[PDB]
Design a protein around this nucleic acid. Structure first.
Lengths: 346, 263, 210
RNA sequence: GGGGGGGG
DNA sequence: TATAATGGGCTGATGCAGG
DNA sequence: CCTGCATCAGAGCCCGAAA
């Protein structure tokens, strides 16, 4: 009924390896990858595709899907065809198929056997915006790639190498998902630094530093305006559903006007404008008002400058610019009488 | 064999080898089937009694199981175990509901309706009310689990710059983000063939992401914003209650052309 | 929403619906003839994790043996319920016991040498070949087997019985075999002349076990 | 796993 | 990318396993 | 068969509500 407790129970199902079982599994994983490389050349196939076909049958047909990067759609048709060529090889060649498949069988058990390691690393990274289980899965993802690059012959215990990749994958995960406005991983690294810097500053100054005292504590390149624009970037959004104190019947979002949609006055004002905008072009003549109306555009905005006007207005090219003015100034006398457009100046 | 060329043991001359002092002894219930020549099934495969194992068909398997090719002991193990299909999750359930002919079910439950003890009468009715509900409606029971989960239009889940240049955002966005991360990472754990204990864990977390989006708090701990005890308000929360859509904006609104004063 | 609409359509209880949706139990879609605890697996049955593993992956168990302690059983040996495997180890499973990591490899090398031996004749047993443990001679009284070359002795003792090899320069002059009941009276690296007793032969003389 | 200072 | 590190901190209405 | 017995969804309106 509790999701943490159940996963802690399920990883307690795999016993942890002994030094020989650990090196055995590590051993077979690496030898299995060397298997698949040589099987690429015998076969004329692609290591990744052979890797997934070996992969398919160890796990069972429970999991069969298209894997990103492989050239063929990976469905039971092609894995049967590709498997039976694999099995169509001489006994000295097909001994390497058997090596691959126990490769991936060991890799699975090597992963499952180190799941408790991820938990005890992840438990230290709580309270940074990712949930425990979200941490674990990201930690497990590092464990998976620590298995694929572990070189067992350096004789380090596996715990030692895996811890590096786990912590690497957790801290990426934090820096990439924790913010509603996702920001680049290195930029969060800088923000986190400002805070550590300030905290020690405050810790010696006995009061909160100003941006200038941070700026110099940051070294060259840092002034106070850059401390200031770094923090405005670091700012996290707040919830529309926040209760406005009282907690009874008040949401922050209820206090926020919608400034996108026009109000009834605005939509009426914009209608009113086009209404007397064209009832003013047609009152000199609509033709020279059509030339000018073609210049700016009631609905379209048809505004370039010199060239296209070479085509269809009715005349050639510099004349439209001239009747531009005469429509404009006939408009301007036309408006000294119909001075009802002054008000639109706001 | 070993790390470096040194410390390997090579055999000095002709001789026979005996194994002593194991780390430990693993007893498995399996069948051993030695082979002289080439082996025709690779390790991991599952097989049934009588299936061809190695040496062009002379050696075969006695039991149902899955194959373990020992190239040291040059013998094909088969550990007895079945090609059982047993599933977990919504994926299981979706199938089982895909696999329901409802008219058949109706016929069978009607037959149970002619039975005393009234209790069997009673529960065959409740089941048959759902059966008939789908039959008349045209809804397929498989639709009670989602493959595609819908996403609400963004202007209904806004993220707006309020007066301050600050940003303010609806809770659904964080409930969607949690969903998207988990779907996305499950997609990658699948392509990378992670163990099923790992895939199982994420698959269940995916459910809980879908369950907090649709009706946070309904089952299990309510998901909260970090450093807040406030349950995020999910779609159900929006619809329902005194502050919900119906009672707060559909059965009654604020209005224009109105005003208030002391009397 | 109670009663579950999915639950009722399927005749799955509240608890049963949770367990399969939240990955606490399996539910079978095609038992492919499985059987567990004596009863065949029926469709739409719910298996725990352990149940699922016993049916899908098979049963097995591995048992530590104390360091240095050797097993009362050998590799590939089929075992019964409660058969004993190490001085403190008893298996709780029938099946094929498999060695994990042998710390001790013993390779018995095959050696075929020709070696000589002289005994009385009233005391020898005549036959064309002797195979291990077979009686070789019986002496009424003790007979002293004498060197028939001069040389340095290289003594090679086996578990029971002995080999003797003389040689001048580094070329072996002689290879003698001392069976059981024949205790060498020389030590390795000793030099002996012709006819010095190399060993005493007492009573029954047999070829050793190996 | 459901709730609060003031006015009527 | 490599010492090792391996299991969390008040009410009523209705549908149920149990005397 | 029936009852304890559990699990869930209810709990007045409008306005200031001092975040």
């Amino acid at each position: 009924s509790d999701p943490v407790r159940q996963y802690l129970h399920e990883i307690g199902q795999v016993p942890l390896l002994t030094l020989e079982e650990e090196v055995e599994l590590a051993r077979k994983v690496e030898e299995g990858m060397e298997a698949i490389k040589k099987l690429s050349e015998i076969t004329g196939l692609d290591p990744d595709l052979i890797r997934e076909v070996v992969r398919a049958k160890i796990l069972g047909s429970a999991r069969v899907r298209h894997i990103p990067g492989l050239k063929e759609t990976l469905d039971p048709k092609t894995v049967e065809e590709i498997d039976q060529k694999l099995k169509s090889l001489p006994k000295e060649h097909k001994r390497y198929l058997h090596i691959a498949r126990e490769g991936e069988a060991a890799r699975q058990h090597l992963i499952e056997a180190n799941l408790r390691l991820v938990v005890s690393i992840a438990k230290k990274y709580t309270g940074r915006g990712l949930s425990f289980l979200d941490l674990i899965q990201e930690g497990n993802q590092g464990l998976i790639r620590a298995v694929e690059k572990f070189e067992y012959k350096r004789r380090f215990k596996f715990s030692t190498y895996a811890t590096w990749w786990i912590r690497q994958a957790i801290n990426r995960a934090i820096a990439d998902q924790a913010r509603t406005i996702r920001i680049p991983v290195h930029m969060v690294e800088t923000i986190n630094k400002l805070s550590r810097t300030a905290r020690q500053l405050q810790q010696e100054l006995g009061r909160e530093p100003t941006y200038e005292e941070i700026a110099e504590a940051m070294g060259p390149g840092w002034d106070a305006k850059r401390v200031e624009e770094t923090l405005k970037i670091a700012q996290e959004p707040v919830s529309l559903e926040t209760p406005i104190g009282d907690e009874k019947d008040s949401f922050y979002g209820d206090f926020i006007p919608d400034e996108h949609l026009p109000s009834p006055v605005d939509a009426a004002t914009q209608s009113l404008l086009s209404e007397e905008l064209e009832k003013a072009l047609s009152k000199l003549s609509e033709r020279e008002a059509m030339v000018l109306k073609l210049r700016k555009g009631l609905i379209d905005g048809r505004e370039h400058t010199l060239e296209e006007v070479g085509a269809f207005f009715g005349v050639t090219r510099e004349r439209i610019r001239q009747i531009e003015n005469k429509a404009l100034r006939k408009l301007k006398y036309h408006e000294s009488r119909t001075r009802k457009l002054r008000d639109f100046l706001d | 064999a070993a790390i470096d060329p040194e410390e390997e043991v090579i055999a000095e001359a002709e001789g026979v080898v005996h194994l002593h002092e194991p780390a430990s002894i693993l007893v498995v219930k399996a069948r051993v089937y030695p082979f002289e020549d080439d082996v025709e099934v690779s390790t991991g495969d599952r097989v049934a009694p009588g299936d061809v194992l190695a040496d062009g068909g002379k050696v075969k398997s006695d039991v149902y199981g899955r194959v373990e090719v020992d190239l040291v002991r040059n013998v094909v193990r088969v550990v007895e175990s079945y090609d059982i299909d047993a599933r977990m999750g919504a994926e299981a359930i979706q199938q089982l509901l895909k696999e329901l002919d409802l008219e058949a079910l109706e016929k069978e439950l009607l037959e149970e309706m002619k039975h005393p003890s009234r209790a069997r009468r009673a529960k065959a009715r409740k089941r048959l009310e759902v059966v008939r509900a789908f039959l008349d409606s045209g809804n397929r029971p498989e639709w009670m689990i989602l493959e595609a989960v819908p996403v609400l239009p963004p202007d209904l889940r806004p993220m707006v710059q309020v007066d301050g240049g600050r940003f303010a955002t609806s809770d659904l966005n964080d409930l969607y983000r949690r969903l998207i991360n988990r779907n996305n990472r499950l997609k990658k754990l699948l392509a990378q063939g992670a163990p099923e204990i790992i895939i199982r864990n994420e698959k269940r977390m995916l459910q809980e992401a879908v369950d907090a989006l649709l009706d946070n708090g309904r089952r299990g701990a309510p998901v909260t914003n970090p450093g807040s005890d406030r349950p995020l308000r999910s779609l159900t929360d929006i619809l329902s209650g005194k502050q919900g859509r119906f009672r707060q904006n559909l059965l009654g609104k604020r209005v224009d052309y109105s005003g208030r004063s002391v009397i | 929403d109670v009663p579950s609409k999915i639950g009722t359509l399927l005749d799955l209880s509240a608890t049963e619906l949770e367990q399969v949706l939240y990955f606490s139990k399996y539910i079978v879609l095609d038992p492919k003839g499985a059987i567990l605890n004596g009863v065949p697996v029926e469709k739409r049955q719910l298996l725990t994790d352990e149940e699922y593993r016993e049916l899908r992956y098979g049963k097995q168990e591995t048992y530590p043996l104390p360091p240095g302690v050797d097993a009362l059983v050998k590799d590939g040996e089929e075992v019964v319920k409660g058969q004993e495997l190490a001085p403190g180890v008893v298996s709780r499973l029938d099946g094929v016991a498999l060695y994990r990591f042998p710390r001790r490899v013993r390779v018995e090398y095959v050696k075929k040498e020709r070696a000589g031996l002289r005994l009385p004749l009233a005391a020898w047993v005549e036959k064309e070949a002797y195979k291990p443990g077979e009686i070789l001679a019986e002496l009424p009284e003790p007979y002293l087997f004498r060197a028939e070359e001069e040389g340095v002795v290289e003594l090679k003792e086996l578990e029971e019985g002995a080999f003797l090899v003389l040689r001048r320069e580094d070329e072996p002059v002689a290879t003698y075999f001392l069976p059981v009941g024949m205790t060498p009276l020389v030590v390795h690296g000793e030099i002996v002349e012709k006819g010095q007793p190399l060993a005493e032969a007492k009573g029954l003389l047999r070829m050793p076990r190996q």
